[PDB]
């Protein structure tokens, strides 16, 4: 059971888009976030912050301001009205989701370099670390019976997130995580072989 339990974890993780209306224990969120932070991070750094959007008027106003920017940006692009609203409808999950947690990059412990190349490299390294912390959260949720779906939208509206949530300039949003009990039971995924995604040299 201990062997198996070890083997099962990451295969319970699906991108869940339809949530039942069962409230989420606060404690599972908190514990799952604690597990998430076992992900690796460069030494003497803390790249990841998780920003849990508990106040519904705050969640809501951030999402409306995002929606608004989306329509005007997609309109500049010359997309037709219907197509814009199709896209915008993709964001409805963040409105209805039982919980929402924004992962953010912060350059805590970042090394400082004089040149642009190594400064970008450093920010990249920090970016993949937050990426690792997000996977570890989705899996921590999934093993506590909780579904989730990573929505990348805040990445395209960093200034609006920062302004709305009153965060300093160097906090960088890396999406949004919708969290809830899935409306439909889902089994274990049976992953496929790596095939062309693994390259031998």
Ligand X SMILES: Cc1cc2nc3c(=O)[nH]c(=O)nc-3n(C[C@H](O)[C@H](O)[C@H](O)COP(=O)(O)O)c2cc1C
* Annotated binding-site residue numbers for coenzyme F420-(gamma-Glu)n: 73
CA distance 37 to 49: 9
65-74 CB contacts, 8 Å cutoff, 24+ apart: 65/157, 65/160, 65/164, 66/91, 66/153, 66/154, 66/157, 66/160, 67/91, 69/157, 69/160
CA distance 157 to 137: 23
Q: Does 153 bind ligand X (CB under 6 A)?
A: yes
Tell me how far, at minimum, the Cβ of 4 lies from ligand X, in Å: 21
Tell me how far, at minimum, the Cβ of 112 lies from ligand X, in Å: 17
CA distance 142 to 181: 9
> For residue 32, which of 14, 50, 44 has the smallest C-alpha distance?
50
Tell me how far, at minimum, the Cβ of 27 lies from ligand X, in Å: 23
Instruction: Return residues touching its own copies (CB under 8 A).
Output: 2, 5-13, 15, 30, 33-35, 37-40, 42, 46, 48-55, 58, 73, 118, 121, 124-125, 127-136, 138-140, 143, 149-150, 152, 155-156, 158, 165, 174-175, 189, 191-194, 197-201
Interacting residues with ligand X between 65 and 124 (CB under 6 A) = 90
* Interface with ligand X (CB under 6 A): 14-15, 17, 38, 40-43, 90, 125, 128-129, 132, 149-153, 175
């Amino acid at each position: 059971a201990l062997e198996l339990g070890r083997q099962q974890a990451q295969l319970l993780r699906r991108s869940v888009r339809r949530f039942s209306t069962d409230p989420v224990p606060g404690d599972l969120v908190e514990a799952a976030v604690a597990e998430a932070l076992t992900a690796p991070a460069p030494h003497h750094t803390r790249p990841t912050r998780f920003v849990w959007l508990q106040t519904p008027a705050i969640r809501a106003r951030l999402l409306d301001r995002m929606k608004d920017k989306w329509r005007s940006d997609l309109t500049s692009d010359g997309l037709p009205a219907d197509a814009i609203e199709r896209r915008v409808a993709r964001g409805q999950i963040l409105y209805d989701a039982p919980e929402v947690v924004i992962p953010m990059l912060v350059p805590d412990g970042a090394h400082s370099y004089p040149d642009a190349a190594r400064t970008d490299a450093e920010h990249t390294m920090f970016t993949v670390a937050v990426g690792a912390a997000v996977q570890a959260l989705l899996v921590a949720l999934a093993v506590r019976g909780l579904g989730s779906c990573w929505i990348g939208s805040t990445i395209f509206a960093a200034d609006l997130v920062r302004d709305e949530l009153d965060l300093p300039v160097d906090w960088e949003p890396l999406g949004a995580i919708a969290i809830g009990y899935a409306d439909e039971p889902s089994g274990l995924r049976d992953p496929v072989p790596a095939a062309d995604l693994l390259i031998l040299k």
